[PDB]
């Protein structure tokens, strides 16, 4: 997973 603006996806 990777995080973008707080959310992991």
């Amino acid at each position: 997973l990777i995080n973008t603006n707080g959310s992991w996806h």
Partner: antibody, heavy 117, light 111 residues
Framework: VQLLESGPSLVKPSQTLSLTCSVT????????WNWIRKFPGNKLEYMGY???????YYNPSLKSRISITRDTSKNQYYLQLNSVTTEDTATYYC????????????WGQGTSVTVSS | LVLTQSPASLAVSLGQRATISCRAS??????????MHWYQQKPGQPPKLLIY???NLESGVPARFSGSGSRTDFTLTIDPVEADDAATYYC?????????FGGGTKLEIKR
């Protein structure tokens, strides 16, 4: 993994606070690299990270006056907090997040910052 | 999202069980994981990772510590509690913006 913070102990109000975190045993081009502070009274506040690719995420209640930067050839990243006030007195921590844990596993000993004239 | 740590403090006797709760106003679960973590902090020391992803034990942490829950309801349990466990404990969620710490729970040892 070892994280060392540096910066000034005493900053005057309405001026900019600048802290450095030096990393050893790991490269800042992997994972995420966070700033955390603890206010007097013990409440903890997450400030934000800079990612392995240079992208940032900021606490919405600080996004206006915070900037997080880095220098890959020094294994350092940097916290900047503008227009400080006495309410920004705290102990400031950097910390690491890896995808192995998705939590802040390695911290540095804090740095104490007092905002005062 | 709001993390309510309960209780704010908690006195327990040596060898007994201590449970600390942390409730969120929205689920901190995504992609099959609970993005909830528990930290211990003592004076003059950074916080220490005890339990990541709600139930997983950090290496070098004694199995007296354990966490459980999903969605919006999580607990940490120390059983049996030891004298070295006197400290403040924090939950933390990083599933979604804004990342936030709990208010903390001061654990006292009754002797």
């Amino acid at each position: 993994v070892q994280l060392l913070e540096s910066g000034p102990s005493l900053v005057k109000p309405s001026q900019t606070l600048s802290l450095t975190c030096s990393v050893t045993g790991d490269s800042i081009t992997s994972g995420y690299w966070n700033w955390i502070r603890k206010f007097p009274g013990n409440k903890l506040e997450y400030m934000g990270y800079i990612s392995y690719s240079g992208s940032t995420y900021y606490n919405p209640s600080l996004k206006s006056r915070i900037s997080i930067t880095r220098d890959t050839s020094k294994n350092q990243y940097y916290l900047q907090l503008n227009s400080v006030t006495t309410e920004d007195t705290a102990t400031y921590y950097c910390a690491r997040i890896t995808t192995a844990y998705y939590a802040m596993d390695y911290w540095g000993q804090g740095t104490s910052v007092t905002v005062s004239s | 999202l709001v993390l309510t740590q309960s209780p704010a403090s908690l006195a327990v006797s040596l060898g007994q069980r201590a449970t600390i709760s942390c409730r969120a106003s929205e689920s901190v679960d995504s992609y099959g994981n609970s993005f909830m973590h528990w930290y211990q902090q003592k004076p003059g020391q950074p916080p220490k990772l005890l339990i990541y992803l709600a139930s997983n034990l950090e290496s070098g942490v004694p199995a007296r510590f354990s966490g459980s829950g999903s969605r919006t309801d999580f607990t940490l349990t120390i059983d049996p509690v030891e004298a070295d466990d006197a400290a403040t404990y924090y939950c933390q969620q990083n599933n979604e913006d804004p990342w936030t710490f709990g208010g903390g729970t001061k654990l006292e040892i009754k002797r």
